[PDB]
Design a protein around this ligand. Structure first.
Ligand SMILES: CC(=O)N[C@H]1[C@H](O[C@H]2[C@@H](O)[C@@H](NC(C)=O)[C@H](O[C@H]3[C@H](O)[C@H]4N=C(N(C)C)O[C@H]4[C@@H]3CO)O[C@@H]2CO)O[C@H](CO)[C@@H](O)[C@H]1O
Length: 539
């Protein structure tokens, strides 16, 4: 007769192909990629013959076999594919096999194959849209927003996006390489911690805790391998296979390292670390480059050279070559994008008409045209067109788009930007014809998290009543609120200005729309982005 039925012994059932040290602070100690997970299973048999051969089955498929020499036993074997498996121990002899009841074992991999879909309900004013317009609908999620801003991956209205970019992957480097970071309390030190023992110019994760260790919805178990933002993004990909999730390298405070890449040795190292990063974190679909300005004029006043333009094009070409190489190894398709200044002065420092051949999308930062960083020359921070009181306005969305088109950039590459925040001044005075923008400010308006900047959510919630004047400039296609008594002036994007941008995109056959940091929207902005571009509603 066949062998008795074995019982699976108590023991850990959670394994990982890519192991993460939930206690590590240094990126070099944080993750280790393996070609497969080392799984172990033990069993006992109290009634019946132990058979002559023991086998481990995963979903009915043999994954191990060996001599069944005793009433109890242990099997060690490898699993090279992530997922949740129904595991069984089978004892066999001439008369047949007898399998134990199934025990679930989890083999984690960074593509999220071991995680159930993260399909959360829409929050606040967000309404469901189908991505059927064929246009890009993107937004940026910030890594550091999970603390005080309390905005986690589960709060992202993911179904309403085609592209989701991640709030800045930094580039390792200390004094003289990331000085711009020193302006943020403890930020430079945090990077040095992440980059402990890591070569300069290789990428890393600025906050390993927030990215992989902090408990979040869906990845809360004390022993889950991947938690934090990355763990949730993996589950998000399971829920939205077609959503493009891209890591964004750079930003205003992390762009300093880019100015040294004219040196191919450093550029090669950077590119090489990006490939390794992508091989390690499978849920990402490519890479976004946010070099805050080839030519300088970014956060660091001591950086910038006429050579940056060429470096940028070379970088994009090499990243593309690296990604093609990656495609040949994994068979997957990867995207290469870049967020760029919308000012003509900076746009002409780069040959985008050339770089565009290596890129999938160009995210035009058509915002920050004006702000508290300038108290004398005020204006619409993210308008589509110039205002009536100053038709010669240089910084507008249209001028940015025209500058690129003039270089020869194909329209379908250009994704227009919308702001989910407003910039503002205080003590505005000396203006004429009741146009606050004609005067000067005495300082920045009180912000939500920093001076001169307010979340759109707060604007709609607090500055749409009381003493606040509201005006929608139909010429520039830009709204603004003004509080006469204190001289508080705020320029931002609203449902209507976003609609104008969307229509503009459709008319000029541009690529789509994207917004800066999803955490600041109450839903009005993203709803309008989708609607204006023609995406259907429904559920
Ligand atoms: C990494 C870091 O230093 N974080 C800081 C944080 O700085 C932020 C804010 O100043 C962002 N501003 C707004 C209006 O949200 C700022 O955003 C920039 C961004 O860098 C540019 N790059 C893009 N892309 C499309 C990729 O868009 C723009 C936006 C709009 O100007 O980014 C910096 C970091 O570069 O500031 C907080 C305090 O507010 C600080 O705690 C820390 O988290």
């Amino acid at each position: 007769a066949a062998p008795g039925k074995p019982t699976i012994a108590w023991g850990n059932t959670k394994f990982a192909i890519v192991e993460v040290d939930q206690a590590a602070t240094a990126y070099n100690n944080l993750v280790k990629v393996k070609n497969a997970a080392d799984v172990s299973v033990s069993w006992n048999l109290w009634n019946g013959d132990a058979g002559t051969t023991a086998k481990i089955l995963l979903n009915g498929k043999e994954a191990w076999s060996g001599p069944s020499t005793g009433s109890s036993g242990t099997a060690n074997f490898k699993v090279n594919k992530g997922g949740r498996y129904q595991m069984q121990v089978a004892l066999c002899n001439a008369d047949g096999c007898t399998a134990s009841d199934a025990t679930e074992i989890v083999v984690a991999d960074t593509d999220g194959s071991h995680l159930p879909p993260l399909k959360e309900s829409l929050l606040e004013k967000n309404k469901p849209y189908k991505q059927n317009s064929g246009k890009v609908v993107g937004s940026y999620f910030v890594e550091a927003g999970v603390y005080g801003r309390n905005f986690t991956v589960d709060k992202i209205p993911a179904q309403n996006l085609t592209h989701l970019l991640y709030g800045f992957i930094p580039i390792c480097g200390g004094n003289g390489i990331n000085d711009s970071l020193k302006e943020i309390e403890g930020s430079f030190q945090a990077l040095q911690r992440s980059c402990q023992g890591r070569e300069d110019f290789k990428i890393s994760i600025h906050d390993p805790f927030a990215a992989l260790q902090k408990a979040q919805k869906g990845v809360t178990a004390w022993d889950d391998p991947y938690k934090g933002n990355f763990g949730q993004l993996m589950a998000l990909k399971q829920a939205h296979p077609d959503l493009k999730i891209l890591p964004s390298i750079g930003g205003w405070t992390l762009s300093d390292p880019f100015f040294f890449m004219g040196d191919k040795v450093k550029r090669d190292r950077f590119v090489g670390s990006v490939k390794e990063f992508l091989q390690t974190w499978k849920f990402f679909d490519g890479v976004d480059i946010d070099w805050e300005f080839p030519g300088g004029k970014g956060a660091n006043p001591n950086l910038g050279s006429p050579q940056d333009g060429e470096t940028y094009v070379l970088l994009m070409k090499e990243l593309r070559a690296m990604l093609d190489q990656l495609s040949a190894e994994t068979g997957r398709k990867y995207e290469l994008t870049s967020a760029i200044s919308a000012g003509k002065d900076k746009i002409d420092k780069v040959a985008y008409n050339v770089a565009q051949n290596s890129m999938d999308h160009i995210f035009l930062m058509s915002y920050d045209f004006y702000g508290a960083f300038d108290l004398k020359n005020l204006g619409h921070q993210t308008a589509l067109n110039a205002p009536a009181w100053k038709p010669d306005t240089a910084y507008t969305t249209v001028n940015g788009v025209n500058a690129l088109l003039a270089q020869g950039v194909k329209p379908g590459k250009i994704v227009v930007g919308t702001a989910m925040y407003g910039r503002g001044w205080t003590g505005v005075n000396g203006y004429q014809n009741n146009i606050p923008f004609t005067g000067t400010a005495t300082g920045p308006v009180k912000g939500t998290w920093e001076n001169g900047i307010v979340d759109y959510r707060q604007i709609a919630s607090q500055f749409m009543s009381g003493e606040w004047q509201y005006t929608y400039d139909a010429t520039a296609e830009a709204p603004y609120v003004f509080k006469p008594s204190t001289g508080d002036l705020i320029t931002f994007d609203d449902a209507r200005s976003v609609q104008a941008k969307g229509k503009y995109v459709l008319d000029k056959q541009l690529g789509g729309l994207f917004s800066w940091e999803i955490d600041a929207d109450n839903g009005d902005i993203l709803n309008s982005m989708n609607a204006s571009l023609g995406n259907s509603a429904g559920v």
